[PDB]
């Protein structure tokens, strides 16, 4: 059986963007993507101040955009919901704090699914590794593929145990 | 003399609080101080409604207290003036964006002074280091120490210099 595996990206404050990038691009680690991904976020936040209100953002629309563009601020649910739509795939965050999965793009009928693992502080990408020398890891799964979600949940359990 | 040393605190929307905490407690880095400091601020704002009114708050007293206690809202001048009274010291903010020092609590005759650095969004605490590493950095200075003002303002002059 192929094994769900974490690949550890740099914890440089941008690990959310770096992890998302890694999975949606099919397994490419490029830390330099982060500034561009943040600017894409700011572009989308500024474009809908009705939705991205002061209530949601905890500050002005403009303030949020400047904030997210920094190299030291952490992406979260707002950023993931945005990236899900932009990349048109489901972004499943597996939360090892209490062992659950938050599924962004849950109800948009994307055909694709990707997974990140999250401990409350760090994000890393997950991928499926194959025991066959010739078959490279896969980071994009079918939305039909519910078994990968189950394996992720177990990996969350194991990761929780190991961390403690 | 030589410029002051910046100690980097997380850009997690509570950086003002963490920075103030760091310097007034003599060099202690603790981001978990933030929910309590916010609560402290809400008490004071609500402890004197006539003073802390919508005129200076920008919203109603109760609205403000609720706002400032969110984990994602920014502290600013209101919080610095309050914390300056509470900790009984001048709080001097080097602004690298505008290139100046804003002094809080100047006219109250506090005996001590702390310094923060600010870029328009993010606060960090400043300190004066000692070559003897066994000697801990100094974060609280005499309110008559002109030299510390200079070592701080140099950081701002240098930032502007770099923009040119």
């Amino acid at each position: 059986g192929p094994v769900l595996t974490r690949t550890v990206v740099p914890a440089d404050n941008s690990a959310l963007f770096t992890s998302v990038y890694y999975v949606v691009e099919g397994g490419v680690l490029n830390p330099a993507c982060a500034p561009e991904m943040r600017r894409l976020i700011a572009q989308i936040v500024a474009s809908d101040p009705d939705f991205y209100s002061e209530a949601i953002l905890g500050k002005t629309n403009q303030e949020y955009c400047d904030w997210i563009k920094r190299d030291d601020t952490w992406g979260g649910a707002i950023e993931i919901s945005i990236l899900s739509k932009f990349y048109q795939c489901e972004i499943c965050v597996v939360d090892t704090q209490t062992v659950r999965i938050d599924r962004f793009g849950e109800d948009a009928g994307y055909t694709k699914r990707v997974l990140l693992i999250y401990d409350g502080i760090h994000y890393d990408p997950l991928q499926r590794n194959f025991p066959d020398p010739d078959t490279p890891p896969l980071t994009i799964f079918s939305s039909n593929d519910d078994i990968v979600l189950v394996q992720a949940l177990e990996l969350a359990d194991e990761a929780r145990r190991r961390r403690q | 003399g030589p410029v002051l040393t910046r100690t980097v605190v997380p850009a997690d929307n509570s950086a003002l609080f963490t920075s103030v905490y760091y310097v007034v407690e003599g060099g202690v880095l603790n981001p978990a101080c933030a929910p309590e400091m916010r609560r402290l601020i809400a008490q004071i704002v609500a402890s004197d409604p006539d003073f802390y009114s919508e005129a200076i708050l920008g919203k109603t007293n109760q609205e403000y207290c609720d706002w400032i206690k969110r984990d994602d809202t920014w502290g600013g001048a209101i919080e610095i003036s309050i914390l300056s009274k509470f900790y009984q010291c001048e709080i001097c903010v080097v602004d690298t964006q505008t290139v100046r020092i804003d002094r809080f609590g100047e006219d109250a005759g506090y005996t001590k002074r702390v310094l923060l650095i600010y870029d328009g969004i993010h606060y960090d605490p400043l300190q004066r280091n000692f070559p003897d590493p066994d000697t801990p950095p100094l974060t609280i200075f005499s309110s008559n120490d002109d030299i510390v003002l200079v070592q701080a303002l140099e950081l701002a002059d240098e930032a502007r210099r770099r923009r040119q």
């Binding site: 914890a11 440089d12 404050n13 190299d71 030291d72 502080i121 | 880095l29």
Partner: peptide
């Protein structure tokens, strides 16, 4: 640095 993140 402790926790910690540096670019």
């Amino acid at each position: 640095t402790l926790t910690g993140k540096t670019i």
